[PDB]
């Protein structure tokens, strides 16, 4: 035991906690955007076909 | 007609309205999750 | 050296976070499906 | 007004598809960050 390394270790299971949910949050925003561009090209499309 | 087409577009823009709020909320329900713990090792190495 | 506090709050801390991830998809599924129903029963 | 509904249909699927694969990926992840710390305890034993 270090009181040391088991704090630092603490700390960097808690930072990246938090890191892994911003990184994922972002992804399925961007992810997201796409699906949503996808379906409002649909609808352009098909308008363009009336 | 027109009303198809403006019924199906709101339901788009309502799913895509619920996604933004939600996950803004989830967002900030996490943050303060977050916040708790790091405040408790903060007063503990205190 | 060990310490039953720092062990339990951390324990919370993912135990919050998994109730929070499962409120907010339940929540999630219910607001998305009064749209759903909504959409569907407009017709006709 | 049928083809409409089924290719809402198929966005309304996808975005399922895209928030379910985006839990599984992020329960991966936040796993092994657990097993991390676990694996880091589990060298106090003898």
């Known amino acids: 035991q270090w009181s040391e390394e088991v704090e630092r ?3 960097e ?3 990246r906690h938090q890191e892994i949910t911003q990184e994922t949050l972002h992804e399925y925003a961007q992810k997201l955007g796409l699906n949503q561009q996808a379906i409002e090209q649909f609808f352009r499309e098909f308008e ?3």
């Open 9 to 11: 270790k603490l700390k």
């Open 13 to 15: 299971f808690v930072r």
């Open 48 to 50: 363009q076909r009336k």
